[PDB]
Amino acid sequence: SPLAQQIKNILSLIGQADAAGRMDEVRTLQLNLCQLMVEYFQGSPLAQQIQNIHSFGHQAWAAGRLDEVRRIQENLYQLMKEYFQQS
């Protein structure tokens, strides 16, 4: 529950940073969100989907598969906004 609130706070900060065009701030906030996701999702079908899609995106990034990274990141943001009820 505190972890869920920390995650919601990062999701909102990411939205503000993206709205401002602050891509390096988006980068570092995503790194923080990653830290919290690895801890929170180390359950419901959505929780399992977030864990699986998060893992897939990291494998895609490690393999340099950048189109899939972008699409996975978009989907993962959507899943996280649903799970944590972040508008």
Contact residues: ligand DMX, CB under 6 A: 53, 71-72, 75
Minimum gap (Å) between residue 58 Cβ and Zn ion: 6
Q: Which of residues 6-65 bind Zn ion (CB under 5 A)?
A: 34
Whether residue 80 contacts residue 74, with contact meaning beta carbons closer than 8 Å, is answered with no
| 14 versus 50: smaller Cβ distance to ligand DMX | 50
CA terminus-to-terminus distance, the chain: 18
| 21 versus 43: smaller Cβ distance to ligand DMX | 43
